[model samples]
Target: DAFVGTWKLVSSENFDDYMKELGVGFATRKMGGMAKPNCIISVNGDVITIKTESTLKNTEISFILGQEFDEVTADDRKVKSTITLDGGVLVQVQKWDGKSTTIKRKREDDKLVVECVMKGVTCTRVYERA
Candidate 1:
């Protein structure tokens, strides 16, 4: 399936830990928990641009399909990354601070599964199609 439409985060696991790792404060986290993030992905040829919008923040990342490039996270962290497709799944690898992180995305049933791993920390977030 094409990841072109807007998506909403229905449920997230370890999301608190992830926010903590990002150094987000309790007030911000509490506000963020109530804000719904909308993700928009567009693909053209080998290039893909993902845009994330919410009341808290707005960010976008553009990268080639198979080539590594520099990307700034929503929180403004710099990371060298690459995106590739494994069958219908979209996989992303980010190299940051001498560590490598991998994120895999696939649709399971009617939900989008995002599995992220970094520094032995694994977090999963599910997005519902909108």
Candidate 2:
């Protein structure tokens, strides 16, 4: 898979607004904004593994495409998550407490680009191969 590699964060934009829409408080948003996470992606057969590592926290999840599974988010929200691949892009949808968000990752211009959306707010994060 093109996305199967370790990627270091290079830039982020509008993350605070996105988190705010997800109901994250000021204190948590401040700390979360200060942390830049590295994404480690791997795929084995039909299952894909995604690991997010940062100074603040580290989390990993593995799932088969189209299957919904349990997920505990960085903000400590328990959600049902499902991931699907479209072309070279990996798209994840998470639903919890009547709220839902989408995260999409794709390779562009030799960099990994991730977009996180909740409500109408969106955050974009760029990561380069590590």
Candidate 3:
């Protein structure tokens, strides 16, 4: 239950550039660039659910650990996604439309550290308790 709580985005590093690595357009990145987003993480057995909210669009996703599923990304691209848990960190790999990305989230003290990498570019997003 490490990440199973409400968290608020505190800071981000090179998020726009990371989105660019994912081929996000300027018009969409304009909206994706936002302030502290409300996030909720929960786990039910092997299923994990993550909800993120922004003024532009809200996202809710859930996946069973080690199971492959079709995931629609924020940029409206479909990907075959799989999740894995390593220690307290949740790692996800998404590949589709000839692109690949990896995301890893781990709780560090009272904050959640999220790392995203696409096309060799990495970005980090930090979140604290709500």
Candidate 4:
């Protein structure tokens, strides 16, 4: 998989706003806003693992393609998550607290680009190879 590598956060836009739309509070948003996180991605057949690491917190997720599973996100929200990969792009949909959020990850220009959307608020995060 093209996304199978360690990526360090390089750029972000409207991240805090995106989280706010997901019902994340100020305290947790501060933690994420202060640190540039790193993501370790691994893929084996239908299984995909993405581990996010930063000074404030770390979270790990393992999921099979097209299969729905329960997850507790870094923001501490319990949700149902499902991820699907298509043409080297990965898309994840999470449903929780009567709302839905979508995150898409793909490689572009030797960097990983993540786009998150919830309730029409969007955040774009770019990660470079570490």
Candidate 5:
């Protein structure tokens, strides 16, 4: 059960006003604010599977390291993504519609740094190991 663990979201900072720029609506944003997404990562050799869970919705993404794969967000947005590892950090690149988004994850001291970039905005989400 190396991957059968829970990781809690410690903090989130959205960039480019992506969410707002996407027209996510007020109610959805309100509900999202109260949501706690639990991430479960499963790895089998070079393949990785990730499950994101929250009160609002559940989504899953799977891919081989360094290979691109099609992904559909929980909100039903279609995109392409790839995952990679730099040292102990995990990096992800997502392409949707006409935009590209990059997310990087690394451990700093006792916390995790999750940096997200979309358009011209860059946001960070911090999480602690649980």
Candidate 6:
């Protein structure tokens, strides 16, 4: 699918506010805002693999469509996560301690656009094929 590719982060907007909505601490939020991560995505049958690589840390996750799994976020928050594909868009929902966040990823033109939403704040990250 179009999502199966290596993508390098081009720009991020309103990420600090988004992280604040997630309860990330000040120091961690600053670091996270400065880290430019590349997303390497692959699909094999019903399973999908997503790898995030950056100057700060590297993380990889593998899950089957619609199956719930444990996820340790880049900022080290543990959450129950489920991912589904709809209309060629990959949507991920993460829940922890009665709170939840949504991440939607889709290919637009030659770029990959990711939207992270928590509470009422929304962050946007755009990536180019690498």
Best by TM-score: 6
Tell me the lDDT of model 2 at 100: 92
For model 6, what is the error of residue 9's alpha carbon versus the real structure, in angstroms, after optimal superposition?
0.3
The predicted structure with the larger TM-score, 3 or 6, is 6
Candidate 6 Cα misplacement greater than 4 A, ranges: none
Error of 4 at 104 (Å): 0.2
Candidate 3's residue-wise lDDT over 53-118, tens digit each? Answer: 877788888988999999888789888998899997899999986778999999888889999999
Per-residue accuracy of model 2 over 37-83 as CA lDDT, tens digit each: 88899999988999999997899999999999999998888999999
Question: Per-residue lDDT tens digits of candidate 4, residues 1-130?
Answer: 7888999999999999998888789999999886799999998877889999998799999999999999999999999999998888899999976889999999898889999999889999999999
Better model by TM-score: candidate 2 vs candidate 5: 2
* lDDT for position 123 in model 3: 92
lDDT of each: 0.79, 0.92, 0.88, 0.92, 0.73, 0.94
RMSD of each: 2.2, 0.9, 1.1, 1.0, 2.7, 0.8
Best by lDDT: 6
Kindly indicate the candidate among 2 and 6 with the higher lDDT: 6
Q: How do all models score by TM-score?
A: 0.84, 0.96, 0.94, 0.96, 0.82, 0.97
lDDT of 5 by residue, 17-89 (tens): 6555545677766766657688877778767888888887888887888998988865556888888887877
Clashing pairs in 4: none
Which TM-score value belongs to model 4?
0.96
Q: Where is model 4 more than 4 Å wrong at Cα?
A: none
Model 1 segments beyond 4 Å from truth? 21-35
Pairs that clash in candidate 6: none
Which portions of model 5 show Cα errors greater than 4 Å?
A: 1-4
**C-alpha-based local distance difference test score of model 5:** 0.73
Ranking by lDDT: 6, 2, 4, 3, 1, 5
